[PDB]
Ligand binder design. Structure first.
Ligand SMILES: Cc1cc2c(cc1C)N([C@H]1CN[C@H](C(=O)O)S1)c1c([nH]c(=O)[nH]c1=O)N2C[C@H](O)[C@H](O)[C@H](O)COP(=O)(O)OP(=O)(O)OC[C@H]1O[C@@H](n2cnc3c(N)ncnc32)[C@H](O)[C@@H]1O
Ligand SMILES: NC(=O)c1ccc[n+]([C@@H]2O[C@H](COP(=O)([O-])OP(=O)(O)OC[C@H]3O[C@@H](n4cnc5c(N)ncnc54)[C@H](O)[C@@H]3O)[C@@H](O)[C@H]2O)c1
Lengths: 1197, 112, 56
């Protein structure tokens, strides 16, 4: 077998001194980066005065010199203007110019535009054009009303003017031309006036091999057309081309560096050879920060390649908003000297700022790779311009900026001696005597959208020059302010922006965010390689760790699921006798652990979090080898464990006091698929709530569990409070059945949860109440995609959601639902993206999908696939390398289904099912998704507000995701947990969790609602009318205490809105004994928005005579509980023997595990909280990607 | 300004629905739309699809979309005041149909 | 003030909405109370007139 991690992430080439200086600057503090840039950008008083004069002259000229004319002419509102341009866009899709005009005159202008994909799919873009503001989603009902109104008011003439305006903008303003031939023809004019051109064919972010081939042949054909037109003018006076490397390979990333050098580089070389033959410029555009250093490896190989010698047209963009910018320039200038090629360097400020802030926050990295104050980028730009102007003999500087102040400072910096070829300026199409190159987009209306939104966002940001030059409140004096001197006079030079949170500070004072690792950073990969190798040399063990000490037992090895030859460690498993002994020991330790004050227990959790953060690299290595995870997923799992510890610590400090007594010994049974995070989360919550814990890890992953217990014990948790019992489900069953077990936390399959519930149904606590079970189980998770979604975004989110971790996430996408009109195109792209995944042993950074956990899991998954294939369903699978034979692998698989009912149970593997639906059947489809009985995660890709409102109001799932993937819920941000067959609740990583692990629940932070259920109020009035005054008052009190209607936004990363809401659970089974008991149960259920089914065997029908219709609509009587489900909960009244018998009957009900609450008649009389309203509402988490339209509205401020 | 029940017929004076009552075909008032769809309307449309009443099901879906039920606006006014305007269900509508298709169209309108 | 506001509001609402397909009813009888003898008088009449109806 190959040595573990011997080939984890070797760099493409040895890192030179100059390359290492780039990497070292990646994320340094802004206060460190700025002072040297200030020093380099300083110019003399005489030059600064001359620059301000020149900048003033430029600005006065710009202010002394379209859609707004149309809006003014027809007195359109904003929404009418947007709707009119969406209509014109649609009308221009009709090719035959006479056919379009007939549709306008005879059909459209007569109002019936609806009868002739939403019209408003691209309205966010036209919103930007009309209003200057970006909205993430489209209010399509508002736009439809506006379009009806404006046509009914103004008729054919306004439509004609709209069409002619959209024609001019999309064919002449957004682009230089629709095809390279058209763009070249239109360039003759300004070329005669001294301008030059760089053409951009508008490809980026290839998803499939076919996409990358299409962009390649677009670039190749453009080079021919440009070179033919250039006709020997050369690289300075003649036109050139700009390319994006992300267009040329579907896996352009550091993780796939070997494929990039082997497959992408030859393509760039072939394009460069063609540009050399015509002697035109070929420029590599700069993209995301994590592609910068990868692109340098391509630049270096190309500049050293003798086949390209004799040609100085190779160009490369560097972004001044980047902290590495000066060091990148030092590297390029030295490469120019070594190679003897005069590299064309386009200096830009940077186009991806919002995305870089969001990415660094999501990844929990030390700092940003870009500046956070706009004035810092301006100083960086000027400093880097001074560096470039000092090297014009070896590089050709190209100053790409529209900012008149930046231009004037550089113009005077460059001095009086100028010749064509020394340097040039550049500008974007559609926005002194020095040459000026126009960056010219070329493409059809369809292909233009991503670039166009990015462009229009920059122009609309309050800090941007284009927005300020057009703002009449901004004086010229403000516009010509020297950024260098403004920064130099600041109190702390280079301070971070006050309103942008470092990743560590996302949650402010609540808790410290967990820190991740940058797998694009070569220093990180080099140190992580050594730590991973060292972790594979360790002799990992898992032992039964009882309060008294380690116990003996049957010992066996733990094998790497990706290669059974790799022994990871050894586990000693627990005998059923020792399991029962551990519970007795935990029972005897319970009072001492309960007596540790809650603040000290929380301090132990924070200490364990610090220890896990420090040990992350070693922990990664164990998770990769024991559980078959990739390094990316292992990082996220360790972060989740750290977040659980810190989140439950903070929730404890906010809530727990002397009256919230522990339950007693808690049995925590955890799954193999998150063998550290869910393991840690369950144990941490139970411990910090004051309960001693019996930890039973999954049989497949005991080593990381044992290491998590060692860390918790090292942090201060006493051995009597946390005992580790490795073994199989028989150990789990022995623990559950133990007499002193006071509660069970289970995460695993629904079937096993059902077996645990059955065992607990016979049981009562010493107080005669049911034993609490928190059971978080499977999901049959769906995603619905409509024809307004962006295919490229969808495919990326689908590939991640279905096949990350080999589909072994509870949240994994199982069923993709595609609107019929776009299904073929998305399926084609999805299959193409499937075939770009690398499957193998996960100790290589290049591996995307690892093994499934066992051969039994493999056999079960492959049996499902073959059944589908035998039924004739289309099955797409990628081929597995022969190396996978030594482990247990299932290839990522796509299966096309006819109906949603083709699926029986959850298939816990990398198997995506695809169904198609007609748009008018969307509501029926949501019904069919709900009808599986599951309710865990759900995704929706759409830009249309009406569709969002419809789907999110009708779907029944615990975790909703809009325009993003459906995996990787973040503790305290997307509290995680479903309903129905997916779980009992409360949600892990949410504010109701700890209250389930104490005998009296505390009031969670922010847990309240000003809304009162109206049926509850109707019931309390009815009670008053019947004379039941005490119960009527109790009902009103329940109405006020209920938190139904709570609606919160949770702190998190920029570019995302994370919502948390409390809803009704559904239909609650009521099993009353007395009339007053029934009234209290009904009040509790109605106050939390639920309907009820009342046990008809109680004989209390006469107690509810003549109910108001509003209350009767919610009440049903049940003689056969199993026939009237599924229920979402149960309330029971009776003595201990009655509660036990009812609990057994409820456990036998088919379907979901019901959260049961029981009370005696006397407790109902004595205790207004006899039934806890916290457990009668349902938590829903919704995470909305608000950057999905292409940028961040809030960050534009 | 204007009320319901014994207080008047509506539409409100000084409001955006007023002029539409004085023409034979009412226009779409400014800002008059809603992204919400009544769930019972949706159930009715599905029922219509199930019995093959395709044109009525189409009409029901279009009523569901064009309904402004759930509109919720803040109107411009003086500082120190928040002035809200919302559209709710009216109550129980008396339906006097003559034909089955007429009944389905009336029910769709009321449920939407 | 209210009479002035009715006039200007219904004028603006007309500019935002009314087109050739929004035909008038015909003669409208406007019956007004004594407690707002200018404002409600004007509001009813202005709305009927601007919608294209002659008023009694
Ligand atoms: C003129 C020009 C600009 C760019 C390119 C070519 C030319 C000729 N390159 C293009 C190719 N790919 C880009 C694309 O969208 O597909 S357009 C280019 C650019 N940017 C890249 O990252 N890679 C490239 O290959 N070009 C865009 C350029 O980076 C910039 O976005 C705009 O030109 C605007 O800059 P400006 O100097 O003319 O305007 P200013 O307003 O003075 O500055 C705006 C910039 O300031 C930065 N910024 C904003 N807010 C900030 C905060 N809070 N902190 C730190 N920096 C901030 C941003 O960079 C913003 O763009
Ligand atoms: N909703 C969630 O949060 C969530 C999270 C992760 C995984 N899951 C689900 O976990 C399942 C896959 O993981 P798994 O293979 O570990 O599930 P599993 O049900 O096979 O085993 C989970 C745990 O239960 C133990 N166990 C088995 N039988 C037992 C019994 N009779 N009594 C007591 N304990 C018993 C096992 O030893 C193991 O520790 C999937 O179905 C997944 O959907 C759910």
């Amino acid at each position: 077998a190959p040595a573990p991690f011997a080939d984890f992430a070797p760099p493409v080439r040895p890192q030179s001194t100059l390359r290492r200086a780039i990497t070292a600057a990646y994320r340094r503090p802004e206060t460190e980066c700025l002072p040297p840039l200030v020093e380099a950008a300083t110019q003399s008083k005489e030059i600064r005065d001359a620059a301000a004069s020149t900048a003033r002259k430029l600005i006065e000229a710009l202010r002394g010199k379209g859609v707004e004319g149309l809006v003014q002419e027809y007195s359109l509102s904003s929404q009418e203007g947007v709707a009119l341009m969406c209509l014109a866009e649609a009308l221009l899709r009709i090719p035959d110019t006479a056919t379009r005009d007939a549709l306008i005159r005879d059909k459209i202008a007569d109002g019936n535009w609806k009868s002739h994909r939403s019209l408003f799919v691209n309205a966010a873009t036209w919103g930007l054009v009309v209003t200057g503001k970006l909205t993430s989603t489209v209010n399509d009902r508002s736009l439809a009303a506006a379009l009806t109104r404006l046509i009914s008011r103004c008729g054919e003439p306004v439509i004609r003017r709209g069409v002619d305006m959209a024609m001019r903008m999309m064919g002449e303003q957004f682009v230089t031309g629709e095809t390279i031939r058209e763009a070249l023809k239109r360039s003759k004019e300004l070329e005669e006036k001294g301008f030059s051109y760089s053409y951009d064919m508008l490809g980026e972010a290839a998803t499939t091999a076919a996409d990358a081939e299409r962009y390649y042949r677009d670039y190749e054909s453009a080079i021919h057309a440009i070179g033919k037109a250039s006709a020997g003018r050369g690289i300075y006076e003649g036109p050139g081309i700009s390319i994006k490397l992300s267009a040329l390979h579907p896996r352009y990333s550091r993780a796939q560096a070997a494929r990039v050098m082997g497959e992408l580089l030859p393509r760039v070389k072939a394009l460069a050879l063609l540009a050399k033959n015509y002697d035109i410029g070929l420029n590599i555009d700069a993209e995301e920060a994590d592609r910068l250093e990868l692109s340098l490896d391509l630049l270096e190989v190309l500049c050293l390649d003798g086949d390209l010698s004799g040609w100085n047209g190779m160009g490369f963009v560097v972004q001044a908003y980047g902290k590495r910018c000066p060091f990148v320039l030092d590297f390029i200038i030295d490469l120019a000297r070594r190679s003897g090629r005069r590299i064309m360097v386009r200096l830009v400020k940077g186009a991806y700022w919002d995305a870089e802030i969001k990415r660094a926050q999501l990844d929990g990295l030390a700092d940003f790779p870009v500046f956070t104050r706009k004035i810092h980028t301006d100083v960086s730009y000027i400093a880097c311009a001074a560096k470039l102007l000092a090297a014009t003999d070896v590089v050709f500087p190209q100053f790409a900026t529209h900012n008149a102040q930046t231009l004037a400072a550089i113009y005077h910096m460059a001095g009086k001696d100028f010749h064509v070829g020394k340097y040039e300026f550049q500008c974007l199409h559609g926005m002194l005597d020095r040459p000026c190159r126009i960056y010219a987009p070329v493409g059809t209306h369809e292909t233009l959208l991503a670039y166009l939104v990015r462009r229009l966002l920059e122009n609309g940001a309050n800090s941007s020059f284009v927005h300020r030059i057009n703002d009449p409140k901004v004086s010229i004096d403000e516009l010509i302010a020297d950024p260098v001197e403004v920064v130099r006079a600041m109190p702390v030079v280079g301070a971070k922006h006050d309103r942008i949170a470092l990743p560590a500070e996302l949650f402010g004072d609540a808790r410290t965010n967990s820190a991740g690792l940058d797998l694009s950073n070569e220093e990180t990969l080099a140190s992580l390689t050594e730590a991973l190798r060292e972790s594979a040399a360790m002799k990992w063990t898992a032992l039964p760790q009882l309060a008294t000490g380690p116990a003996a037992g049957e010992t066996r090895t733990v094998l790497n699921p990706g290669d059974h030859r790799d022994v990871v460690g050894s586990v000693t498993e627990t005998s059923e006798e020792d399991a029962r002994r551990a519970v007795r020991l935990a029972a005897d330790a319970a009072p001492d652990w309960a007596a540790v004050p809650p603040s000290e227990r929380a301090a132990c959790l924070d200490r364990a979090a610090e220890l896990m953060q420090a040990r992350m690299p070693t922990l990664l290595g164990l998770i990769i080898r024991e559980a078959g995870k990739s390094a990316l997923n292992a990082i996220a799992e360790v972060r989740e464990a750290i977040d659980f510890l810190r989140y439950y610590a903070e929730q404890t400090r906010r809530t727990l006091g002397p009256g919230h007594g522990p339950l007693g010994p808690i049995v925590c049974i955890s799954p193999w698929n998150f063998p550290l995070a869910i393991f840690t989360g369950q144990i941490a919550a139970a411990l910090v709530a004051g309960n001693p814990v019996l930890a039973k890890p999954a049989e497949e992953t005991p080593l990381i569990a044992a290491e998590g217990v060692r860390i918790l014990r090292e942090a201060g948790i006493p051995a009597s409070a946390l005992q580790l019992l490795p073994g199989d489900g028989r150990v789990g069953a022995a623990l559950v059945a133990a007499a002193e077990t006071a509660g069970v936390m289970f995460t695993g399959s629904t079937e096993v949860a059902r077996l645990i519930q059955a065992q607990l149904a016979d049981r009562l606590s010493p107080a005669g109440r049911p034993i609490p079970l928190i059971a978080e189980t499977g999901g049959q998770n769906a995603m619905i995609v409509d024809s307004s979604a962006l295919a490229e975004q969808v495919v990326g989110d689908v590939i991640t959601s279905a096949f990350d971790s080999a589909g072994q996430r509870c949240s994994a996408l199982r069923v993709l639902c595609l609107q019929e009109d776009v299904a073929d195109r998305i399926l084609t792209m999805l299959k193409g993206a499937l075939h770009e995944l690398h499957i193998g042993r996960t100790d290589r950074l290049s591996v995307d999908v690892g093994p499934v956990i066992t051969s039994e899991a493999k056999d079960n998954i492959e049996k499902h696939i073959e059944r589908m294939r035998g039924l004739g369903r289309k099955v797409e699978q990628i081929g597995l390398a022969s190396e996978t034979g030594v482990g247990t692998f299932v290839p990522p698989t796509i299966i096309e289904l006819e109906k949603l009912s083709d699926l029986q149970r959850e298939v816990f593997g990398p198997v995506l099912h695809v169904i198609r639906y007609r748009r008018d059947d969307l509501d029926r489809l949501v019904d069919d998704v709900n009808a599986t009985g599951y309710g865990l995660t759900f995704g929706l890709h759409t830009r249309l507000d009406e569709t969002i409102a419809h789907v999110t109001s009708r779907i029944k799932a615990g975790n909703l995701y809009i325009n993003r993937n459906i995996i990787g819920a973040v503790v305290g941000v997307q509290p995680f947990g479903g309903r129905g067959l997916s779980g009992t609740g409360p949600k892990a990583g949410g504010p109701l969790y700890l209250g389930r692990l104490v005998t009296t629940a505390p009031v969670p932070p922010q847990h309240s609602s000003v809304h009162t259920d109206p049926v509850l109020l109707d019931f309390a009035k009815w009670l008053d009318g019947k004379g039941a005054r005490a119960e009527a008052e109790a009902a009103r009190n329940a109405g006020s205490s209920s938190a139904l209607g709570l609606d919160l936004e949770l702190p998190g990363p920029v570019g995302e809105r994370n919502l948390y809401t409390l809803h009704a659970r559904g239909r609650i089974l009521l099993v009353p004994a007395t009339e007053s008991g029934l009234y209290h149960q009904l009040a509790a259920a109605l106050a939390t928005g639920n309907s009820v089914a009342i046990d008809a065997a109680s004989g209390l029908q006469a107690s509810l005579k003549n109910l108001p219709q509003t209350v009767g609509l919610r009440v049903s009587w049940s003689k056969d509980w199993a026939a009237d489900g599924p229920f979402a909960g149960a309330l029971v009244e009776g003595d201990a023997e009655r509660i036990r018998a009812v609990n057994k009957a409820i456990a036998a009900l088919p379907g979901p595990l019901l959260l049961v609450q029981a009370a005696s008649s006397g407790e109902i009389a004595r205790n207004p909280d006899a039934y806890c309203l916290n457990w009668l509402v349902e938590e829903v988490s919704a995470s909305i990607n608000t950057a999905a339209a292409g940028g961040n509205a809030s960050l534009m401020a």
